[PDB]
Amino acid sequence: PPFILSPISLTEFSQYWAEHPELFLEPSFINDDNYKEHCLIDPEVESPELARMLAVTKWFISTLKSQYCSRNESLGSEKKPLNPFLGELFVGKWENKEHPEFGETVLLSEQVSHHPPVTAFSIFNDKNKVKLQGYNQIKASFTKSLMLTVKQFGHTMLDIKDESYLVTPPPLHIEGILVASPFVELEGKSYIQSSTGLLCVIEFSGVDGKKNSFKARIYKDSKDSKDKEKALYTISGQWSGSSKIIKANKKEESRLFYDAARIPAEHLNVKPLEEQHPLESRKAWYDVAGAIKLGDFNLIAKTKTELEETQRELRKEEEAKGISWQRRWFKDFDYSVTPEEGALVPEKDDTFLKLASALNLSTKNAPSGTLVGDKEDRKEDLSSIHWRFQRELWDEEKEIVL
Numbered sequence: 001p002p003f004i005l006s007p008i009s010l011t012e013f014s015q016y017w018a019e020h021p022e023l024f025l026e027p028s029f030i031n032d033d034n035y036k037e038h039c040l041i042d043p044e045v046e047s048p049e050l051a052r053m054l055a056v057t058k059w060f061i062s063t064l065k066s067q068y069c070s071r072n073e074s075l076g077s078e079k080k081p082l083n084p085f086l087g088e089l090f091v092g093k094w095e096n097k098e099h100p101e102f103g104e105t106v107l108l109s110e111q112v113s114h115h116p117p118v119t120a121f122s123i124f125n126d127k128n129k130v131k132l133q134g135y136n137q138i139k140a141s142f143t144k145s146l147m148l149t150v151k152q153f154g155h156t157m158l159d160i161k162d163e164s165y166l167v168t169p170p171p172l173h174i175e176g177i178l179v180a181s182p183f184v185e186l187e188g189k190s191y192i193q194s195s196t197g198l199l200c201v202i203e204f205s206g207v208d209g210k211k212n213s214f215k216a217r218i219y220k221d222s223k224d225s226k227d228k229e230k231a232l233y234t235i236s237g238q239w240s241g242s243s244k245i246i247k248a249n250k251k252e253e254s255r256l257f258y259d260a261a262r263i264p265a266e267h268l269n270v271k272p273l274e275e276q277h278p279l280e281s282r283k284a285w286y287d288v289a290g291a292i293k294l295g296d297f298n299l300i301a302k303t304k305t306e307l308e309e310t311q312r313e314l315r316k317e318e319e320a321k322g323i324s325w326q327r328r329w330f331k332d333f334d335y336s337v338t339p340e341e342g343a344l345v346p347e348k349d350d351t352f353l354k355l356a357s358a359l360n361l362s363t364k365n366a367p368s369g370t371l372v373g374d375k376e377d378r379k380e381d382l383s384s385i386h387w388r389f390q391r392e393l394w395d396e397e398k399e400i401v402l
Contacts, residue, residue, distance in 0.1 A: 003078035007289035008279040011090040014109035014121035015065040021266040023059040027052045027160040028128040049196040054271040064239040082112035086175045092270040092282040103127030120330040122389040129161045135387035152368040164195035166355035168369045193359040212240040
């Protein structure tokens with residue numbers, strides 16, 4: 001066992017959707033009057049919608065490394081994920097003081113389900129009108145071989161002012177591939193469907209091809225995505241390393257698209273344990289995390305039972321104050337054709353339904369990226385529940401602060 005063990009609650013993994021402050025906000029600084037300047041990899045980008053789609057694609061790739069690489073040699077740490085308890089919260093903010101034009105970007109993460117485990121999150125920047133929200137859920141199991149496949153469920157939505165993007169995470173990742181390491185590989189297709197019609201398809205190598213490699217293609221619309229030759233741009237390389245982009249078929253003009261080595265200057269600002277509510281992750285798992293570094297499973301069992309008892313009493317107090325701790329900032333909406341009575345239902349102009357339609361994506365609780373008609377989508381009575389952020393609920397939060 002190498003490196004310094006770092007137990008971290010899965011509720012914290014939500015922060016990796018905006019680890020690079022500048023990449024997260026770039027799309028919002030691109031308008032009709034400067035788009036050609038805001039596109040390093042192609043000073044001759046056809047339209048602003050296209051420059052924004054490239055900026056979004058870059059931002060998406062930048063989130064991958066931290067999500068799937070547990071070891072980090074420039075820090076000497078090995079991440080040990082902790083299964084969040086119901087009602088757990090993790091909040092913080094990127095102050096971006098070194099860039100006044102960016103503004104404060106807030107992160108709210110919450111464990112909305114324990115059985116099964118579901119994490120919901122929202123990252124929003126009021127100043128530039130950039131907001132993201134999504135939820136995550138996985139199902140692991142072994143295949144004929146050490147394999148151990150993890151299916152991804154859920155999706156995320158990005159709003160750049162009035163422009164919308166539907167992002168679906170990597171459908172699959174394989175664990176326990178390399179000897180003596182928690183190395184992980186991605187497989188399947190991820191999509192970035194914009195309200196502008198543009199669609200990006202990101203294909204992961206799986207256990208084949210290069211290590212942690214991908215092939216991204218941007219199409220003018222969903223129909224075009226059926227033929228790889230109609231791709232406006234093609235990006236390929238390592239999502240944990242570097243990649244290059246090629247416009248049309250001009251292989252003679254390949255440019256460096258993204259290099260994961262780049263370390264972000266801005267760090268997520270999280271308040272110290274002293275001023276943290278007992279529902280917040282770092283404070284709730286502190287002892288357990290310590291015991292886990294000690295390695296003593298007797299101390300781990302003890303600290304765990306204590307977290308449980310603490311949390312049990314905390315919930316009682318939360319209710320006593322009339323606080324809906326179980327669904328504090330996110331509510332579960334039913335998107336099925338015929339929902340149950342009391343179920344929260346979507347609105348008529350639901351962004352998710354619009355974009356999913358354009359992409360022809362299953363709106364059911366199937367693996368991420370499942371297309372309508374796929375085996376997974378045809379399954380008998382599959383639910384269609386999706387978690388949604390409610391800004392107002394955060395606006396009236398009386399206990400949690402940043």
